[PDB]
A paper describes a structure:
Many NLR proteins nucleate the “inflammasome”—a large macromolecular complex that triggers inflammatory cell death and cytokine secretion in response to microbial or danger-associated ligands. Extending this analysis, we also found that specific type II interface motifs directly dictate the compatibility of heterotypic pairwise CARD-CARD interactions among NLRP1, CARD8, NLRC4, ASC, and CASP1.
To test this, we first identified the Type II interfaces in published ASC-CARD and CASP1-CARD filament structures. In ASC-CARD filaments, this bridge consists of two residues Gln185 and Tyr187, which extend from the Type IIb surface and interact with Ala168 and Asn170 on the Type IIa surface. To do so, ASC-CARD must engage upstream sensors, self-oligomerize, and activate CASP1-CARD simultaneously. For instance, instead of a prominent negative Asp residue in CARD8 Type IIb surface, ASC-CARD uses a less-charged Asn residue to enhance the interaction with Ala168 on its own type IIa surface. In addition, the tyrosine residue (Tyr187) on ASC-CARD Type IIb demonstrate a more inwards orientation as compared to the equivalent tyrosine residue on CARD8 type IIb surface (Tyr527), thus allowing it to effectively engage both its own Type IIa as well as that of CASP1-CARD.
Author numbering:
A (entry chain L), B (entry chain D), C (entry chain K), D (entry chain H), E (entry chain J), F (entry chain G), ...: 112 to 194
């Protein structure tokens, strides 16, 4: 949404389930080379940064898909930042 | 509580009942992949470190849940660090 | 099939007989170094990810072989995802 | 097309898959010295500028080829700027 | 062959056994500094790009050797692109 | 402040948390192209130089924001140079 | 505007986003030969002087366009010099 | 102290209790991202190098804290280098 | 010998007793940091590659030592490649 | 030789081991400022042109030295252009 | 001093820490445009020549400051040329 | 010594223990920014080239120290090139 880009610096630090979001987004948005490129950089925030590297090329129609994925996996930190 | 993050270095070394706390937190907070990921690393404190890897994504409504679980299982070490 | 790549995210989580599939595919498709490389990463889905790392190099003639192996081992989760 | 030169300032900023366009266009249009020359300038838009340096030497028959490449790789940002 | 330069963009993406080709080509063609330089860049296609950087310095008498090595390791993807 | 430009040569050498300051300053002052341009130049002070390249374009109303960010992350080196 | 020529010596020194202004003014005002000619002279103010070399061939109808570009990119240094 | 920087090359090789010092220094000096960044690099001295990467930003008031932690854990190698 | 560098690609794959050769070479040739660095990378050939990383710095006087160690441990694969 | 100046246009494009030729020629012919000056211009042929800038100051007695260096490193592209 | 202009040709070739001398002299003597202008010309001595372009506009009261900077950074090449 | 500059091209290729030489030379000769700058460029000889970039700034009194370090760590390649 605009919630993703609005709360960018907070979602960099408190998300700990990248490995599942990658499988949720595979095929639909992220190509394979980017999927392999994200699986590196052991520092966990770096996976988030490298993931947000492909955010500027997204329209309003798929950031919503990622927000649904976050609402299926966590659904608590989403509510934590919403409140 | 704030007691959990306040007394981290003491709770890493002196908690010896991970195998039950994992069952207390299952379904409610911990997903299945993280649950399988904790059951490794034979060094007993390392399971505690892997558990605290998921602490930053916790709100005030579930750290209390974990302290309740510790007051049901141990209830003396909780009192030992409280005093 | 195209069913293997179509239901990838579901097959990552619910297949629990990797140690036999590896023996089914040995000699025919997987070389020895890859076979030794898969037997690591205690987190059970990670073996599945390491297995799908070698999938892009598969044609229509061997993915069918893997679906045959799954129909010999599980044959219920295959039936569970087909329905 | 004329869409490439019409939306230049938008395509400079929102394209994040240059490393694949180079291989799609290799041999057909871009010589090798240009291919090695693009793989520099870490600032990602700078690869786009260095690529548009070779646009004036293109006819109507190959800018269409590049639009096909974008419709095969992204096909969403293309649709985002079309609408 | 000329098959190597003919199917460059396809061979960038679908080859997953670089770690063995390196040992096949060592001593005969590739010097040691290039051998150490290839063992980097975790993105798997980048190893392929850095490898094809040394392709222009090859005559007709050694690309045949590399195709033989590819026919000894995979022997299916060679057949997959041949058909 | 005037403290930022007053102690420039000391702050070039002893700051080790650039990757977080960028996320604190993102959206508000630094555009995205500069953000991508800073994540280069492995020599750690060079990130500081490239960051101070955009300092002359700052008024009194945002250097205060950067000093607040330094007082939230480090809060000791700020205190170390103040004393 | 007349603000541009009124504050010439201040806008020579404190503008750090030439690389975007060029893309804002491209096609509308600046021809391509000047666009390539400005991208030289590593000293950043020299790009500004070379840009103001083309100010005399501008009417009241396009300096306004450039001030709009500065109000979209920076919008703070403009406000800093206005006050 | 000055003893930490004076005997740097000796403390790189003979300290084998990083996993505990990290918990001793957590919250007080090391932020979370650096704590996650140290827990990598299987080569045991590399954790020491990555830890000393954050040493130049320390005043006299916390290097003493680290020497106290070393005197509580080891208390023999400190005495070994002192004598 | 020259047999070590001559049969490199065969010795990468068929030696399965690294943990003993390391003890044979300790103190005499390998320093301790390299010894710790080799005991990683679970894929068994990777220990061989990391071991041959230190081969170019060997004279004729110690590669013979390694061949004697292999003739004490294996003495069949040595004979298998000799014949 | 006269082969160097005779096959200049072929040796500009297909030589990919400049970084070693520099060390082969160091001390004997190239001064230090030229040695540092060649290590720039990421485009690989540009190092070749900057290298041939110093060819006119060479007699018949050192172009032979460079041909010897090329026959020691590559010895196949030399053979490829000889035939 | 007069030592700077007396040993100019020796200080052109053997100084390897320009990037710090610039920060030592910044604000006091060097303006910002000269600071940006020196940071070019990859050939390391060229930064030294461009630096000595501004020596003629210096009195006896600041060449002493620059010699102090050299005695704080190197203090050996100063000592090497003094002896 | 003069042995260091005489056998430069041989010491570029056959030394594999840079990570220890850096700690031997730290504080005494190499400043910290150069120390951080050397720990890059994954190609093992490139660390050596970046190291010899600072060699011209060494007198007869410290190259001896570096040869002592080489005789303490390796003491075999030193003897190998001496003979």
């Amino acid at each position: 949404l605009h919630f993703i880009d609005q709360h960018r610096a907070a979602l960099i630090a408190r998300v700990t389930n990248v490995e599942w979001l990658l499988d949720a987004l595979y095929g639909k948005v992220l190509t394979d080379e980017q999927y392999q490129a994200v699986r590196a950089e052991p520092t966990n925030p770096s996976k988030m940064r490298k993931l947000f590297s492909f955010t500027p090329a997204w329209n309003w129609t798929c950031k919503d898909l990622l927000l649904q994925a976050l609402r299926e996996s966590q659904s608590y930190l989403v509510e934590d930042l919403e409140r």
